[PDB]
Symmetry: C2
Subunit: 137 residues, 2 copies
């Protein structure tokens, strides 16, 4: 449900798993005490602020890596949209999700509506699924 | 010697392995035929231009991932610098590298010289080792 990403690849606006919650990063800093990177983010569901420091590892001699956890993105085929902000989507295997919620970040629904009239929904799981991006394709 | 990175994390200026060579990315585009991402980069050793398209994978149902290969970074303790552009460094195990070359990208040697007067060198292997970044820590 998550994937480790080297910290030097992460930038403001990226989605990370902060304290077990998918969050959009709004600030990145470095700890002068440990050298860890610090990520402040906005919970995509509750809009609460969360912070988490990076995980240091030493897998091989002279190889030290700083990572954060990023969410695994699922692409669903978009079948329909509704006037309440939800969409009807279908998984790769044919499972129909009747009312998937869409984030209000960057007016995502309006862009999906403009593209619908072959759009793919990029969905994040946190049991609750959430459309956080889209791809035309 | 390499690590896969999701394409949406890669930005201009990042170092990738293009056609088996470490390259600094200078342009990113998308193929309208396949949806693959295309990366044009400058070879850090020969200064030649290389291009490579992303690798698509479908590991899990509804999970499609576009990745590129990035180099594994080694951190060496910097022991000395020389007037010819090289540095003396030591690995985590104590192996002394007497004359490690440094890239001229972003005047890296001048920044290392200013920081030396506890600096760590970030080194890339392509048998030939190359200092491509530095860290104070």
């Amino acid at each position: 449900e998550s994937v480790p990403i080297p910290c030097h690849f992460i930038r403001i606006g990226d989605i990370l798993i902060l304290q077990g919650r998918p969050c959009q990063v709004i600030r990145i800093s470095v700890s002068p005490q440990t050298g860890q990177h610090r990520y402040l983010g906005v919970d995509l569901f509750t809009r609460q602020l969360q912070e988490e420091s990076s995980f240091v590892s030493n897998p091989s001699p002279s190889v030290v890596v700083q990572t954060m956890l990023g969410p695994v993105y699922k692409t669903y085929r978009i079948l329909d949209l509704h006037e309440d902000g939800t969409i009807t989507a279908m998984t790769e295997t044919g499972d129909v999700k009747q009312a998937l919620p869409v984030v209000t970040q960057g007016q995502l629904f309006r862009k999906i509506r403009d593209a619908f009239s072959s759009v793919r929904a990029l969905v994040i799981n946190d049991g609750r699924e959430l459309v956080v991006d889209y791809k035309v394709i």
